[PDB]
């Protein structure tokens, strides 16, 4: 693309260098890629780094020259699920339509279903709405995690 | 009634509430040759009833087209025909009102 | 019944119904339609 | 039921849920002559449910 935002991009790359000159590793380059807006499934991650395996990525980084056109790729992808989608989606997901969605269900249906992520990752994202009817409405956090 | 003293929240819930018994009129039932049972031909307008009130429609539909009445200790399901349908729905309106 | 097949797959044809509140009965048809199944496979009743 | 495969607990399952979602009481009928095991079936139903 444009050097325009190439240099926020520079400060972030570096930012998060464990080794302070531009070699930052898989899983953390596509963390930080997901930080930048930019948040795509770790599929296609993979498919756009090479395909490689889980010890390639934990052991090989990259530099910020093919950063560029991995980013490149990624904003190929142009667009993600919609607000819509999540929306209905989670309304439809309730039990009886109540403005809210259970939270031990939607834990339980985050951390076990398609993309697989740990227990206290959907928990501190849960956290803080929570209820004592345990039923969070899903409307706020959804905008909230879309907007931010 | 804001000198009164009424919050804006509940003076939206009554005029919804009153929206409701408002389209309570529009519900129609149909008779069948078959056994003429109270049946529900569009129910949109109960449809946006129970949304705007807060009940699911099926269960409501069901219980009105279909009374859970109760004899002796044994729960029993009959059917209605239009008379008692109608009657029962202004009856609820007058009680809700 | 006729309400509860929309609302457990209008998330499949999205699209389908208009945003307005509809009669399960032409919600039910039209998402059908749009789904383009074969009129064998199934069947419109009156109340099902 | 179409997830699973067949077994006594999936269909006490989807007995238990239809009667949760249409409202209409489900009911169960095992059925067989004497010595076919009439018995464990419905014990291990009334355990699961």
Do not use: W
Not at chain 1, 131 to 136: K, P, R, V, Y
Not at chain 2, 60 to 76: C, E, N, Q, Y
């Amino acid at each position: 693309f444009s050097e325009e935002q190439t240099a926020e991009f520079k400060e972030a790359f570096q930012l998060f260098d464990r080794t302070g000159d531009g070699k930052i590793l898989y899983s953390q380059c596509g963390d930080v890629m997901r930080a930048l807006g930019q948040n795509p499934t770790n599929a296609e991650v993979m498919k756009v780094l090479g395909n490689p395996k889980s010890d390639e990525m934990n052991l090989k980084t990259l530099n910020f020259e093919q950063f560029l056109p991995m980013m490149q790729t990624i904003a190929k992808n142009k667009d993600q699920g919609c607000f819509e989608d999540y929306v209905e989606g989670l309304r439809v997901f309730d039990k009886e339509g109540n403005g809210t969605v259970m939270g031990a269900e939607i834990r339980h249906v985050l951390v076990t279903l398609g993309e697989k992520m740990t227990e206290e990752e959907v928990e501190q994202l849960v956290a803080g709405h929570e209820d004592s009817n345990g039923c969070i409405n899903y409307e706020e956090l959804v905008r909230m995690v879309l907007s931010g | 009634m804001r000198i009164m003293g009424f919050t804006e929240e509940e003076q939206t819930s009554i005029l919804r509430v009153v929206s409701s018994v408002l389209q309570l009129g529009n519900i129609v039932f149909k008779k069948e040759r078959n056994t003429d049972q109270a049946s529900m031909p569009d129910n949109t307008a109960a449809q946006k009833v129970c949304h705007l009130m807060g009940i699911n429609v099926t269960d409501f539909t069901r219980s009105i087209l279909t009374p859970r009445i109760k004899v002796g200790r044994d729960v029993v399901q009959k059917a209605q025909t239009k008379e008692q349908a109608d009657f029962a729905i202004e009856a609820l309106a007058k009680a809700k009102f | 019944v006729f309400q509860e097949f929309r609302q457990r797959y209008e998330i499949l044809a999205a699209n389908a119904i208009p945003k307005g509140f509809m009669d399960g009965k032409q919600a039910c048809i039209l998402m059908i339609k749009a789904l383009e199944l074969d009129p064998n496979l199934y069947r419109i009743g009156q109340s099902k | 039921r179409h997830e699973m495969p067949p077994h006594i607990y999936a269909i006490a399952d989807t007995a238990y849920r239809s009667m949760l979602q249409d409202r209409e009481d489900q009911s169960i009928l095992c059925t067989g002559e004497s010595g076919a095991g009439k018995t464990e079936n419905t014990k291990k139903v009334i355990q699961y449910l």
